């Protein structure tokens, strides 16, 4: 009792041929032959099937790259292009099918109306018949659709047999020698003179032009997607869709080519239809080929007023036939089958669009009833939308809008095969190899050129609705991840441009501040993220380091989940930063690994920004040694450093995004820069880049000095000063404050040999000897003295930037250098940044 | 010197006044009022000014968001929608102004010519007099404009005064009681019955339509951006622009309403113009309303043959007014002010474009004289375009094309505001009270509707020129970085898996075979990095080190290998390869495969080096990496002009690729050869897959494997089966294995694990006897599988065997190296030993 | 489990017989 699955004949080919075949076979193809001649009609047919052949190749390539499921064509396009461009146009495909149901039931109601009028009495006026008949027949179609998916197939094969009987009837009729009723109306069976005369065009009327015939034929060679829209009922779609679609195209094209060339070799363009017009001996000389076959249509031809023949009578194909009502049965089948195919297609596509929740308020229609989970709620919606348009009943102006909703799907079926094939992601590997990448682009271009040629003001409606529904999904971010070629183009393009940096040398004219930020977990201290993402956005690189302190190195896959949870926090704050974490047994070695290996070619960090050890007085003195060693390692690797201190600390750990002070307008405060060393120009470059943004543009920056030097860079610097007095004894309380803060790090050895001091300094290298204290007294006094000047001139600034001191390695221990760093920036309101470049010409240009 | 600035009255409001004032105020509002009445002319005016006031709200919300130079009107489009649309729209907006200069100048030349022909004689042809006067006038306007922006701002206040004296002239003329001549043309003073008559439409002529009057008025109400194009010369652009711009619109629309409603109460719609219509009693009755004042106007009213009146005479204001030449003066001012305002706005935008760094299309025009900071080379471009279009003198067929350029600008400005406000862009945050994004979206929709309502074929040329420019400009560091940060939002799917590699290549010119092999399947597909570890104690980053790194990059680029280069410093090789695995890369472009060479001389090297060589693979497996080990007969190292040539640089031909797929590793062992065969040198190579299985299920398993490889779409040719995989090898091959595991054998009897560790702590690479006995079958399997491989794959182009992995702590590093040596010896072709990380890299599905 | 697995169809389907993780064939037991 498993649900029934279909083969390729009964499931794809029959459905596609029934959909393609319409009424233009029976009521307009002979007239097109009469107008344009045989040769130009064949050219119209071939130009028309080129587009739908290229689209068949594209949709055959798409559906042989995986396992196709119960979604139809929306499934293919959306899983090969993405939710934006797939869900924008899976909603107009499903609507255009629902209204094509109505526009194929109207064409059957008109035929029944004509049949009833010319036999007896009609029901009502000749427009409300179109309503009664159409509404009653769309209901039997709905009952067939709801009755199961194995009764739809029986109806389709019945319609197919009816159409083939029609073809046989016509082709038998064109061979019987003509009768009097038929030869008077123009039909003289196959002749060479009536075929040669009828090759050349003979245009007559307002719409008798080449483009006026193309515009009639082309929308009837379309509809090739019907059998691909039941992907969820086929045994193996990856082998059933490419065969069915392409053989349906081939065989319907052969049918179109045979009908025209056969009708145009038997029927003459002008004929009168009066049995008295048989030729009379001695009636001078007459007009036309029909004079040889013994008929006389001179008067008609001349006065231009005869009502029969290939170019005047629309049912020429019904009188050539051996029996007339069989052609009417063929016309019934050719319309009912297309209506049923559209009704099934719309409700299969809409259910899949409603299960993938991209749009609001339409979930209700995705429920599946019964064992095959048929869309019972989608059939009723397509039924309501079809009845609403049947009641309008004059759809001569709504047809161009709908026929352009279907050429906009043709342009995205062809863009899906062009994009997937030029992106070339490992993983796109289709079984169907008989397609091209440039033909699939020509198809996408020409389906829009044709869209505009057919009707300029309906192409606009199509494209406008496509844009509206595209932008809704773009602004909604529906969080679905199906492998898509747009997702695979981002990597292609990132790699393509990143490699291209290798072709450019290292120069002095392209310095950029590329910084490595030691944040730990980014949300534990977002102030660093904000400060650094202010001045480096859209200009250079920014990496957020993180060291996972611990004895086991093993990248179990759990780690990737945490890393992706930290990489989305930075994507939500709209920070343009990378995230990188490493494993090491202590923080110094993790930082050293990040400094050695991170980056990619020429895009690698050259500045190290790190917070400040707020708790260095309480923590075990083994941590201070490694903290200072980090800065020493940065200076050894030829980096530049920045130490950032805030009064309240940076670690906020001790949902919603937290807010810091670097996200807000500063005002008309000042940025104070204490330029004490010609480090190269980083100390002056960080505030110049920072203050040029909107939030800091209303501040004036006042560089101090320990005039023509600052001029040549064109840094736009406001004030220049001279520090009052840097080397004098400060107040005794400040000196004792420095002296007692460092005392718990003192060795108390009087004065001894340096080796002897090292003998007990080996176990604790952070101990300070009295000789080291004595021989670095002036510098310590300078550090304690400059704090008072900073307190004076910068009580109420918005940012203070001071030159960073360097302790002589070996002769300056860790605790004393850390005390210096503590004593240049204690008790200050603003953020304080201590910078020192790496002796490189930085200001050699603007940035 | 001191740069000149302007307030809001003289800098924004006056400019927008004079830009909006046109000839329509003088020559066509009386006609429109007669043709459509008062109450419906008011509707036209209000509907027209709604669009311009919504765009004014948008353009004044942009000005309270930062500060912009002159002509940065497009800078928001290029910030919100990319600097391609922005640049193209800026170029079109400047060109349209440059042509508007020509249109206003010829409109002034027509008036002066028609005045001159009356009071004198025309020296030359009517058409050429236009081409002389227009060129002279544009030259004089350029001379005024190019000589400072203080003189232009004085001329454009003289124009304001001339217009305001004409308003007073007209309004004092309407109050004087009519003269005998003036009443003979239609003028009677303000009176109620004429006002009541004229409240309702009276359509006459081929243009008497509501839309026929809208299409004439609406393009005469735009010009509100004349004050926002000089935001760089304003004193306070965030308070001056929103107020001046929005008050100018109000004060011009009040004037339009006042003039229409005050001339509608004043004249009659038609009048004879002859003085001999004195009315006397006796001749019938009077047919009209003018007879109540003593004038017979029946001669025209029945025959439609009078040349005066409100609906027939275009120059009614010249006679209603108390003095005629002042209205001519008003027209002169109203035209020259518009021409000047269009000439300065074109220069500002062209200069901003030529100075733009993100749009070089037209950045090479000329050298500009910035001594007085004038846009000289933005003035000489507008002057040339204006003079060309004046000489052409074809206008009325180019007016709609250029009226739609401005509406394209309006639509994209409003949509850029909406887009930046809906996507919460970080940097769009205006401070303007009355700004709503839904109004800024209605403005865009309406600006696009009106384009196609006014002239449909000129809105398809305006759009088709934006797309020509946009697609012509689309087709190093700033692109490498903006695309790498864009990868952070895409998620990872199994369909887009890329094999990124870390090649342990040393100096890339000691083993070119490794780089040649790995740069074959990763070319244009995925990341490749050439690692190098410099063994030495802690070493200073040095200038020479970067010189060496540049030399190796140059060598790589000369060979046209598309790879990155990276080197680290470490105490030994293993501890540096860990650094490279942990930190190399950038974001989502980080390696996940490790490629090494074969330790060719492990037999004779110091057995502590094989410990580290195997530890490298152990660490790779610890980090979730895939491993490839490559072997050649003659070794990889070639150190033992022209670059060296390997066998991977030549066409392989018809030989085969043999994949001994023995264990399921997720499919990397199948996906490396597939990508290798996607390239031109390996595309003619047959691929054979050998799998192991039983002897009673040869077919049952062969069909299953063929079915599996067909759902992956890989396209491999044969599938063989190996049933003799568990036999014993030949005796003299087992002996060859066991004599090689001898120097590494512990010979400890059979002791507990503690006793083994006792003598294995110093050397951990030796093999206990228990580990010899428990690894007997696993080892003879390698010995026999080598026999099978050498049996089948004697003359292939590439052999691929799945790599065994030994349990950490149950396989000493000499046993595992012995297995690796056994699997691949005595073979001619290159041998690759792949082993993925047990995660799927291949998929059946598409979702 | 503990021993490596020969190629098989069930490892790639979506719906038992899960291939061992790299930590199960490599980490010390
Ligand atoms: N696990 C880590 N990973 C990366 N960087 C770190 C880590 N721990 C500390 N850092 C860096 O070192 C700086 C100072 O070290 P310290 O441990 O004193 O900071 P903290 O005390 O954690 O936070 P705060 O400085 O706000 O009190 C930190 O601000 C941070 O920049
Ligand atoms: N300095 C290095 N940096 C990175 N990888 C290396 C380095 N030295 C060796 N390797 C990798 O290890 C493999 C084996 O190294 P080995 O010491 O055996 O050198 P070899 O010349 O390749 O072989 P052999 O020394 O046995 O002739 C090499 O092929 C290479 O891939
Ligand atoms: C005959 N049809 C023509 C357009 S004729 C104009 C019209 F009346 F339709 F507006 N195009 C398609 C295309 C497809 Cl692809 C499908 S279908 N069911 O495969 O998806 C159905 C049709 S059609 O039935 O509408
Ligand atoms: C009256 N003008 C109409 C165009 S109607 C005449 C036509 F061009 F169609 F031939 N629109 C605009 C728009 C702007 Cl924005 C500006 S301006 N200086 O602010 O940039 C100037 C003008 S206008 O003065 O040319
Ligand atoms: Na049909
Ligand atoms: Na003007």
Write down the domain spans for chain C. Answer: 1-29
Instruction: Judge whether A696 is annotated as a binding position.
Output: no
Cβ of A97 less than 6 Å from ligand 3: yes
Asked if A597 lies within 8 A of B586 by C-beta distance, the reply is no
Best of A478, A492, A497, A581 to substitute, by most chain B Cβ atoms within 10 angstroms, is: A497
Hunting for tokens 């206040």 — which residue is that?
Answer: B157
- Are B614 and B812 in contact by the 8 Å Cβ rule? The answer is no
Instruction: Judge whether B409 is annotated as a binding position.
Output: no
Structure determination method: cryo-EM
- Are C17 and C8 in contact by the 8 Å Cβ rule? The answer is yes
Who's near A2: CB < 8 A, 6+ residues apart?
A: none
Ligand 5 centroid vs A121 CA: distance in angstroms?
Answer: 29
Q: Which atom of ligand 2 is nearest to the CA of B600?
A: 26
Breaks in chain C (C–N > 2.5 Å) following residue: 15
Residue B292's closest CA among B193, B180, B226?
Answer: B193
A593's tokens: 């690994």
Hunting for tokens 């028309």 — which residue is that?
Answer: A48
CA gap B732, B745 in Å, rounded: 20
Ligand 5 centroid vs A16 CA: distance in angstroms?
Answer: 9
CA gap A733, A741 in Å, rounded: 12
CB < 8 Å & 24+ apart, contacts of B214-218: B214/B44, B214/B47, B214/B48, B215/B454, B216/B24, B216/B28, B216/B32, B217/B24, B217/B28, B217/B32, B217/B44, B217/B45, B217/B48, B218/B44, B218/B48, B218/B51, B218/B450, B218/B454
C-alpha distance from residue A751 to each of A451, A744, A765, A774, B301 (Å): 96, 18, 17, 10, 126
Q: Which residue of C has its CA nearest to B619?
A: C26
A810's tokens: 């070996």
Residue B182's closest CA among B260, B298, B267?
Answer: B267
Cβ of B595 less than 6 Å from ligand 2: no
B556's tokens: 């790589």
**Running DSSP on this structure, what letter comes out for residue B648?**
G
Judged on CB neighbours under 10 Å (0-12, 13-18, 19+), B312 is buried
Instruction: Judge whether A76 is annotated as a binding position.
Output: no
- Are B319 and B121 in contact by the 8 Å Cβ rule? The answer is no
- Are B810 and B772 in contact by the 8 Å Cβ rule? The answer is no
Asked if C22 lies within 8 A of B621 by C-beta distance, the reply is yes
For chain A, how big is the Rg over CA atoms in Å? 42
For chain B, how big is the Rg over CA atoms in Å? 44
Instruction: Judge whether B579 is annotated as a binding position.
Output: no
Q: What is the DSSP string of A595-609?
A: HHH-BBTTB---EEE
Sign of the dihedral defined by the CA atoms of residues A745, A751, A755, A756, in that order? negative
Asked if A553 lies within 8 A of B846 by C-beta distance, the reply is no
Who's near A430: CB < 8 A, 6+ residues apart?
A: A61, A62, A64, A65, B713
Asked if B705 lies within 8 A of C13 by C-beta distance, the reply is no
Instruction: Judge whether B780 is annotated as a binding position.
Output: no
Ligand 3 centroid vs A223 CA: distance in angstroms?
Answer: 4
A497's tokens: 């441009």
Beta bridge partners of A187: A267
- Are A30 and A399 in contact by the 8 Å Cβ rule? The answer is no
Secondary element (H or E) of residue A155: helix A149-173
Q: What is the DSSP string of A188-202?
A: --S-SHHHHTTSS--
**Running DSSP on this structure, what letter comes out for residue A2?**
P
Q: Give the closest-approach CA distance of A473 to chain B in angstroms.
A: 12
CA gap A28, A314 in Å, rounded: 7
- In B329-468 the beta strands, taken as DSSP E runs, fall at none
Asked if C7 lies within 8 A of B705 by C-beta distance, the reply is yes
User: Which of B476, B497, B580 is nearest residue A597 as measured by Cβ atoms?
Assistant: B580
Who's near B478: CB < 8 A, 6+ residues apart?
A: none
Contact residues on chain A for B587, CB-CB shorter than 8 A: 578-579
Subunits in contact with chain A (3 or more CB pairs closer than 8 Å): B
Asked if C6 lies within 8 A of B708 by C-beta distance, the reply is no
Judged on CB neighbours under 10 Å (0-12, 13-18, 19+), A276 is exposed
Ligand 2 centroid vs B121 CA: distance in angstroms?
Answer: 100
Cβ of B60 less than 6 Å from ligand 4: no
Mutation choice for ligand 2 from B506, B580, B611, CB with most ligand atoms inside 8 A: B506
CA gap A487, B789 in Å, rounded: 41
CA gap B771, B765 in Å, rounded: 12
Instruction: Judge whether A552 is annotated as a binding position.
Output: no
C-alpha distance from residue B289 to each of A292, B200, B257 (Å): 78, 15, 25
A248's tokens: 């349906």
Q: Which atom of ligand 1 is nearest to the CA of A644?
A: 29
Instruction: Judge whether B410 is annotated as a binding position.
Output: yes
User: Which of A427, A504, A555 is nearest residue B497 as measured by Cβ atoms?
Assistant: A427
- Are B189 and B178 in contact by the 8 Å Cβ rule? The answer is yes
Q: Give the closest-approach CA distance of B455 to chain A in angstroms.
A: 13
Residue nearest to atom 13 of ligand 2 (CA): B597
Cα B657 to chain centroid distance, Å, stands at 45
- A577 SS3 class: coil
Residue contacts between B and C (CB atoms, under 8 Å): 55
Helices (H) and strands (E) in chain B, counts: 31, 10
Cβ of A92 less than 6 Å from ligand 3: no
- Are A198 and A17 in contact by the 8 Å Cβ rule? The answer is no
Cβ of B97 less than 6 Å from ligand 4: yes
Nearest ligand for residue B19 CA: 6
CB < 8 Å & 24+ apart, contacts of A367-373: A371/A1, A371/A3, A372/A3, A372/A149
Q: Which residues of B touch C (CB under 8 A)?
A: 618, 621-622, 624, 661-664, 666, 691-693, 704-705, 707-708, 805, 807-810, 837-838, 840, 842-845
CA gap A216, B464 in Å, rounded: 28
Breaks in chain A (C–N > 2.5 Å) following residue: 654, 706
A329's tokens: 């049965």
CA gap A482, A74 in Å, rounded: 13
CA gap A745, A767 in Å, rounded: 5
Cβ of A318 less than 6 Å from ligand 3: no
Residue B526's closest CA among B499, B503, B561, B504?
Answer: B499
Breaks in chain B (C–N > 2.5 Å) following residue: 475, 640
Query: Percentage helix, strand, coil, to 5, in chain A?
Result: 55, 10, 35
Contact residues on chain B for C14, CB-CB shorter than 8 A: 845
Best of C18, C22, C28 to substitute, by most chain B Cβ atoms within 10 angstroms, is: C22
Mutation choice for ligand 2 from B567, B600, B615, CB with most ligand atoms inside 8 A: B600
CA gap B75, A221 in Å, rounded: 48
Nearest ligand for residue B570 CA: 2
For chain C, how big is the Rg over CA atoms in Å? 10
Ligand 3 centroid vs A133 CA: distance in angstroms?
Answer: 22
Mutation choice for ligand 1 from A516, A517, A520, CB with most ligand atoms inside 8 A: A520
Ligand 6 centroid vs B734 CA: distance in angstroms?
Answer: 103
Beta bridge partners of A836: A641
Judged on CB neighbours under 10 Å (0-12, 13-18, 19+), B641 is exposed
Asked if C7 lies within 8 A of B805 by C-beta distance, the reply is no
Mutation choice for ligand 4 from B335, B406, B407, B410, CB with most ligand atoms inside 8 A: B406
Burial profile B474-511: b = 16 or more Cβ within 10 angstroms, e = fewer = eeebeebbebbbebbebeebebbbbbbbbbbbbbbbeb
Ligand 3 centroid vs A101 CA: distance in angstroms?
Answer: 9
CB within 5 A of ion ligand 5: which residues? A 21, 334, 337-338
User: Which of C4, C13, C22 is nearest residue B663 as measured by Cβ atoms?
Assistant: C4
Residue B101's closest CA among B479, B402, B442?
Answer: B402
Beta bridge partners of A549: A584
CA gap A423, A292 in Å, rounded: 66
Residue B16's closest CA among B60, B78, B74?
Answer: B60
B769's tokens: 């006897």
A676's tokens: 């004490």
Beta bridge partners of A641: A608, A836
CA gap B514, B503 in Å, rounded: 8
C9's tokens: 């169809």
Subunits in contact with chain C (3 or more CB pairs closer than 8 Å): B
CA gap A694, B65 in Å, rounded: 9
């Amino acid at each position: 009792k498993e649900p029934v699955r279909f083969g390729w004949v009964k499931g794809v080919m029959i459905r596609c041929m029934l959909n393609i075949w319409g009424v233009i076979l029976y009521l307009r193809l002979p007239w097109i032959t009469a107008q344009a001649g045989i040769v130009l009609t064949w050219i119209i047919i071939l130009l028309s099937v080129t587009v739908t052949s290229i689209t068949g190749l594209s949709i055959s390539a798409i559906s042989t790259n995986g396992k196709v499921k119960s979604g139809g064509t929306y499934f293919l396009i959306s899983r090969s292009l993405g939710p934006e461009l797939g869900g924008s146009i899976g909603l107009i495909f499903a609507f255009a099918n629902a209204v094509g149901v109505a526009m194929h039931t109207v064409g059957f109601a008109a035929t029944v109306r004509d049949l009833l009028q010319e036999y007896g009495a009609p029901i009502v006026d000749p427009i409300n018949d179109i309503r009664i008949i159409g509404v009653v027949s769309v209901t039997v179609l709905l009952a067939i659709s709801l009755a199961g998916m194995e009764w739809e197939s029986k109806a389709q094969v019945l319609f197919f047999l009816v159409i083939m009987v029609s073809f046989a009837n016509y082709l038998v009729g064109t061979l019987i020698p003509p009768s009097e009723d038929k030869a008077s109306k123009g039909f003289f069976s196959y002749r060479a003179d009536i075929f040669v005369q009828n090759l050349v065009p003979d245009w007559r009327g307002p719409d008798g032009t080449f483009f006026g015939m193309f515009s009639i034929f082309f929308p009837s060679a379309t509809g090739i997607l019907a059998g691909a829209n039941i992907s969820g009922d086929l045994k193996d779609p990856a082998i059933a869709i490419p065969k069915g679609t392409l053989m349906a195209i081939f065989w319907t094209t052969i049918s179109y080519l045979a009908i025209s060339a056969t009708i145009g070799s038997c029927v003459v363009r002008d004929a009168s239809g009066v049995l008295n017009d048989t030729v009379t001996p001695g009636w001078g000389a007459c007009e036309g080929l029909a004079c040889s076959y013994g008929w006389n249509f001179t008067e008609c031809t001349q006065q231009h007023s005869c009502h029969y023949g290939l170019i005047n009578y629309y049912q020429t194909m019904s009188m050539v036939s051996g029996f007339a009502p069989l052609i009417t049965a063929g016309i019934f089948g050719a319309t009912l089958s297309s209506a049923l195919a559209c009704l099934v297609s719309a409700a299969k596509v809409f259910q899949c669009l409603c299960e993938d929740q991209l749009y609001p308020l339409i979930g209700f229609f995705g429920k599946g009833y019964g064992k095959n989970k048929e869309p019972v709620r989608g059939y009723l919606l397509a039924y309501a939308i079809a009845v609403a348009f049947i009641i309008i009943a004059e759809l001569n102006t709504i047809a161009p809008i709908i026929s352009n909703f279907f050429l906009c799907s043709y342009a995205l079926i062809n863009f899906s095969c062009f994009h997937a094939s030029i992106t070339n992601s490992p993983g796109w590997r289709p079984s169907f190899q008989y397609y091209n990448k440039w033909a699939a682009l020509f198809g996408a271009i020409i389906s829009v050129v044709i869209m505009f040629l057919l009707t300029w003001w309906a192409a606009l409606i199509a494209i406008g609705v496509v844009l509206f529904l595209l932008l809704y999904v773009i602004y909604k971010k529906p969080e679905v991840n199906w492998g898509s070629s747009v997702q695979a183009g981002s990597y292609n393009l990132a790699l393509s441009y990143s490699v291209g940096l290798n072709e450019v040398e290292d120069h002095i004219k392209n310095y950029r501040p590329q910084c490595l930020v030691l944040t730990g977990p980014p949300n534990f201290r977002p102030a660093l993220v904000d400060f650094v993402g202010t001045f480096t956005r859209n200009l250079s690189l920014m990496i957020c380091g993180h060291v996972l302190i611990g004895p086991h190195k093993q990248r179990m896959p759990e780690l990737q989940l945490i890393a992706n949870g930290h990489t989305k926090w930075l994507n939500k704050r709209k920070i343009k930063a990378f995230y990188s974490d490493v494993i090491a047994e202590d923080l110094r070695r993790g930082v050293q690994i990040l400094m050695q290996a991170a980056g990619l070619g020429r895009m690698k960090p050259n500045i190290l920004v790190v917070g400040f050890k707020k708790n260095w007085q309480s923590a075990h003195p083994a941590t201070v040694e490694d903290y200072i060693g980090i800065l020493h390692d940065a200076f050894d690797f030829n980096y530049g450093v920045c130490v950032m201190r805030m009064r309240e600390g940076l670690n906020v750990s001790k949902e919603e995004q937290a807010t810091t002070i670097f996200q807000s307008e500063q005002g008309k405060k000042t940025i104070d820069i204490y330029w004490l060393f010609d480090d190269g120009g980083l100390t002056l470059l960080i505030p110049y880049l920072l203050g040029r943004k909107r939030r800091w543009s209303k501040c004036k920056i006042r560089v101090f000095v320990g005039i023509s030097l600052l001029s040549k860079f064109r840094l736009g610097f406001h004030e220049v000063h001279i520090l009052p007095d840097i080397n004098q004894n400060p107040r005794a309380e400040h000196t004792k404050r420095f002296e007692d803060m460092i005392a718990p790090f003192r060795l108390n050895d009087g004065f001894k040999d340096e080796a002897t001091v090292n003998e007990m300094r080996r176990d604790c290298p952070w101990k300070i000897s009295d000789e080291e204290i004595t021989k670095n007294r002036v510098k310590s006094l300078r550090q304690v003295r400059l704090n008072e000047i900073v307190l004076d001139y910068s009580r109420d600034a918005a940012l203070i930037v001071i030159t960073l001191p360097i302790g002589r390695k070996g002769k300056c221990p860790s605790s004393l250098y850390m005390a210096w760093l503590e004593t240049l920036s204690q008790d200050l309101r603003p953020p304080v940044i201590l910078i020192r470049g790496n002796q490189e010409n930085v200001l050699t240009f603007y940035c």
